[PDB]
Amino acid sequence: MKYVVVSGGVISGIGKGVLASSTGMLLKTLGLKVTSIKIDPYMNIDAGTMSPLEHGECFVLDDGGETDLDLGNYERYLGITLSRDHNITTGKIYSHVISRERRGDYLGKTVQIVPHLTNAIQDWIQRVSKIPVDDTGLEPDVCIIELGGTVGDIESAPFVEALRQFQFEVGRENFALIHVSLVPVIHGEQKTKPTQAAIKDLRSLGLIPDMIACRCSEELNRSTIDKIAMFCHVGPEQVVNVHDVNSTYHVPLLLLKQHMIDYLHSRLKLGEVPLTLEDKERGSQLLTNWENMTKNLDDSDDVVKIALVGKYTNLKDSYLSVTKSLEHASMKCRRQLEILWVEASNLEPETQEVDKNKFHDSWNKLSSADGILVPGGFGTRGIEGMILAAKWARESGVPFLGVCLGLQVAAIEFARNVIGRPNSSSTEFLDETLLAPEDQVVITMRLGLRPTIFQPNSEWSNIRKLYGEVNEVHERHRHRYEINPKIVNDMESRGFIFVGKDETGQRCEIFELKGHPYYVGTQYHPEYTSKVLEPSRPFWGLVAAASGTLGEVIKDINL
Template identity: 40%
Template sequence: MARYIFITGGVVSSLGKGLASAALGALLQARGYSVRLRKLDPYLNVDPGTMSPFEHGEVFVTDDGAETDLDLGHYERFTGVAARRTDSVSSGRIYSNVLEKERRGDYLGRTIQVIPHVTNEIKDFLKFGEDEVDFMLCEIGGTVGDIEGLPFFEAIRQFGQDKPRGQCIYVHLTLLPYMAASGELKTKPTQHSVKELRSIGIAPDVLVCRSEMPIPPKEREKLALFCNVRPEAVIAAQDLRSIYEAPLAYHKEGLDQAVLDAFMISPAPKPNLSKWEDVVDRIHNAEGEVKVAIVGKYTQLEDAYKSIAEALTHGGIANRVKVRAEWIDSERLDTEVDIAPLLEGYNAILVPGGFGERGTEGKIRAAHFARERQVPYLGICLGMQMAVVEASRNLLGLTDAGSEEFDREAGAQRYTHVIYHLKEWLEGNRTIKREVSDDKGGTMRLGAYNATLVAGSQAAAIYDTTSISERHRHRYEVDITYRDKLEESGLKFSGLSPDGRLPEIVEIPGHPWFIGVQFHPELKSKPFAPHPLFADFVRAAKDQSRLV
């Protein structure tokens, strides 16, 4: 049966609970333990699938088709454990489940209350898969004191009481602000945060304190005394040059040892951190630099493309180069008469996914620039579709090529539909049917799907196989009926769904590196196992940099 580690936050949000959870999971793995990480989010959305990237950042997608918080991406990148639908839940999902049960009569007419019905639903969620791993790490979103988070805090308090003594511990992440005027780290906000947590009935076993500098012994002793934890369980978490230093930094501070001590596991297995030492060495001892332009529509918030940014870093790790990603708003390319000054000087161009027509003409122009100027190009999801539209317009001569999605937004047909809404497809042995009028969260092709690559293609060479599985998140597909004419004009369909109906990869033979993919390869990339597409894309950018 798994031991549970609950990670909570206080003082301010965005302190890095997800990163701390992921790094702790990696450290426990390094000691030979199996782990699974979960996220409990207090917001009332059922999931982040319909939330704007400006609101919540990236939507991370699992193999089984769940749309989840971006922290699950951190979990996967640090542990290599593929997240599942049962690893993410929101207040909206919890309340939805409770209300569905009430409507079915499962509660036999009883009055439905937060305690015990909502808290029991949360505890049932926590129990999924508890016999599969040694440690279950559960991060609670938000900060202690948030009104919407109270049912989750009460649930994990009850859960700790329900389990045998020593089966659950609590790690609390807080901020130690530095007062420049007095030259001090202030412990009072952390003391108040722990007081708030204790008022709920939860006593932290380990304190992780974000700070701009090391915690002096005097402040460490004060935190231990007033927060009722051992001095060695007060862990400093300073800013790092790279997030991938976190496992080594937390190990140096003694986080994993403090956790094992709290569980009274002794003697603890020694950790093997060699793969993290190699990752950090490759980052800090890069042998060059490449510049990649990311042409997207959500560039004001970099978390909207978090997995892409990290996958590019992983590609740099694979090639021992630093990748300097620069964000270009695709709407700027919509209106500029000459886009060359905005795109020249980059060693590669990446066009990511997105929804809606805004900024798409800029993405099409970016694909055109990369194709004509022989600049390495990676188009992901909508980025692939816009590359196909560009080829249809400028190679095939369909000057009005476009997407059914854009016509639906405008309420009138303006384009030849090279991109169309797929209403039926196979998922294993099941036929899935969708209508455009369905709920937003139910109209997409979500999760892992297989694809067959054309033997001898660039894609097959990169993957070193002709059979792959990748994660999807999109509503519209490239129309396969245009395949023959597009291939005659120079755009090769090098990856298709097993039934041959759905284009998955396109490429341009003879181009230094021009590939579009309908799926999201960034979701499966890890620092110690870079995705082959990103590793080869950065290699091509590296080769391009030598030509400049």
């Protein structure tokens, strides 16, 4: 096993997840199998309790693991599948040793943070980095560790001490450290003393970095590079200039231009890992596919506008997987994506009493949209706004996708406005009020990867067509409610066909409305299964419907 640790810096939120993902993608272009571990110094066992207002969206795994947003970045860049064990947290590892003590597995010794907890960390990283993450049952060749937080924080102290020991418990040339750092630019001068103080913290903590990755608002001056290469004991070829770029799909081709594969191949002896010529064709076949999609990103010009209708649309990280999944669809259509961020509560008429500026900008955006996404939000407070957005799309012929809550607000709309039961509602919003036309009912989270099976009278639908007309759809779930089965044949009598269901038939999972160009809803989250070179089919269908050429896309899918 080789290890690359991506670490620390002057600030949090600097770019370690981007460089970790680019490094893994780049190493994969030598044919190497790459895995990843996120370490988060936070104490939470997993992200499933904590709200999207900190660290962005909760990411959902095939396991049903509700995990760190960084694991989603590795899944999409590398083409890999991760377990809940691939996210280390302070909570998991302190919990592991405490549960092991009360059972007596330390045989009556005193259990100390060094060695015992720092040995639990190294036992975990070795257990987990050998887990299969590809379509093939090979153990990986490289693990990337993203060390969360900043080096020199108390919460990081056990993890840097475990990595200090891991650098020796595993051999040298099986371990490298990349340190990401900030170069401020002040009055036209690029300042080196923040990055120098960060190299002192690594030395203090007993680690040496093999690369410095410098994050800056400019290209680094070669005099600034020389200075960093004087204070840190590294050559000029070991400071990579990682400036601010408009697109993160370009960052792998920045580091390829900067010899970082060529360095790591001589620092980690990567040419001495056994690989076939088949593995070495697959590597450059991924590289040329990356150069294709990045060329097609730069010379594309024709725009498509998608309204994302939700709450808290100012924290754009609360929709990170949705956003990436709209981008992958856009890149496969070769049209420039603009997301129009629409707060659903501002669509409600009462906003015109509260602040007229917010009311009109929301409807200005929703009218401007070539397609609409209701993204699969959290907490029912915006539903009466999203019901307008679903009504607008159905009354007007505008392309629509409804994810999770986007099944539900669309079925609630269709019930109130096409069946004509005007109070019919989400039981999560009203519960004890006991209305008779319950659209949502509870059937205790239904979590992780499940099979969805198409109902037989459904090959007419665009959504079965986009999935290659394969009999089953396997996708990730994070829901507690269903559509009520008693209202299904009522809705189907009116053309709102539940095109796909759970194998038991009690649970409604995909619809398409008859006759509309594209009015699709999924109870799963199709975001989490999106890959950079293979967009998620419901999002590719929305961006194609919004662009025209939905038929030419369905034709290409059918080969």
